[model samples]
Target: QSMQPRRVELWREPKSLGISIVGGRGIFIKHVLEDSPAGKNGTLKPGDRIVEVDGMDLRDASHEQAVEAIRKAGNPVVFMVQSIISTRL
Candidate 1:
């Protein structure tokens, strides 16, 4: 009898662009990794505003729940992000 190795698929859930709490109100992404999967995916950018995840209104989501949702996606999670590029102009 021949023994065969089973193949397991390992997928990394996409990470949210890092955010820093500010003004006791919200968070912000200071910088985005260059050429990261998130950058290439175009769902998130350095200056993009993350307002929600998995269709659960962000304001209602706790930080831990937000993190878990991303991890459960098993793939690059799509975000409803708003761009703040104009703010800098």
Candidate 2:
């Protein structure tokens, strides 16, 4: 299990990243819609823990707080996510 934090830069013409999230105090991507902003990025995947939104840290953020941050962010949003994909040994 090797997890690394990565920065994901995503852009959208409208104001939506087309993603759903889960977790409180540890925000994670629950889903990404196909052909959507997050989906098109091709880097963001489900189970990736969101570390920050733009520049706001989410390590200690509540689910509501994380949602608010993402909801209020503008286009070209920056996300710091921890990769949780496990590789076969």
Candidate 3:
């Protein structure tokens, strides 16, 4: 895993986390909104694998389970992801 860990924050409520994640053990970033919280700092990128949500590891979690963790993160979402260097986005 050449993936590097990265974290980012988003506004509490009435806000968008600014990114989307795909499902699986390979659950990874699928998209990033250019004008959202994630885009504000520009730390997250497409294809980044989601390994943890607020310190909870999603590596073995099902797609729905992983998503649940994020939603449960409440106000100012925190995320730790494994970012892999790739020419393919």
Candidate 4:
């Protein structure tokens, strides 16, 4: 299957960027805070699988590694995502 991943970038807030991820091996967005950067930006949706952060590939990353990459990425972090609804099993 082919995926045309969308690019979403969000500036970091003082404390939080307002996103949650679930699962390992393939991390997916669990939730987004309504008033937060991601929510206001509005490209991210629940169940969108995050494939890359900034420029870091996450295909083989552990759960901790994924989170850590996100945490360390600079402001206006860019993400490449594949929507769950578009991915065929």
Best by lDDT: 4
lDDT at residue 18 of model 3 (Cα atoms):
77
lDDT of 3 by residue, 41-80 (tens): 6878888888888788887888889887887887677787
| Residue pairs whose backbone atoms clash in candidate 4 | none
Candidate 1 Cα outliers beyond 4 Å, as residue runs: 1-27, 85-89
TM-score, predicted candidate 1 vs. hidden true structure: 0.50
Separately for all candidates shown, the number of backbone clashes (residues 3 or more apart, or on different chains) is 0, 0, 0, 0
Could you arrange the candidates by TM-score from highest to lowest?
4, 2, 3, 1
Worst 10 residues of 3 by lDDT: 7-16
lDDT of model 4 at residue 17?
86
What is the TM-score of each predicted model, taking all chains together? 0.50, 0.85, 0.78, 0.87
How close is each model in CA RMSD to the real structure?
13.8, 2.9, 3.6, 2.4
Task: Give candidate 1's error at residue 86 in angstroms.
Answer: 7.7
Identify the superior model by TM-score, candidate 1 or candidate 2: 2
Flag the better candidate by lDDT, 1 or 4. Answer: 4
What's the CA error at residue 81 for candidate 1, in Å? 0.6
Relative to the unseen true structure, what is the C-alpha lDDT of residue 8 in candidate 2, on a scale of 0 to 100? 92
Clashing pairs in 2: none
* Of 2 and 3, the candidate ranking higher by TM-score: 2
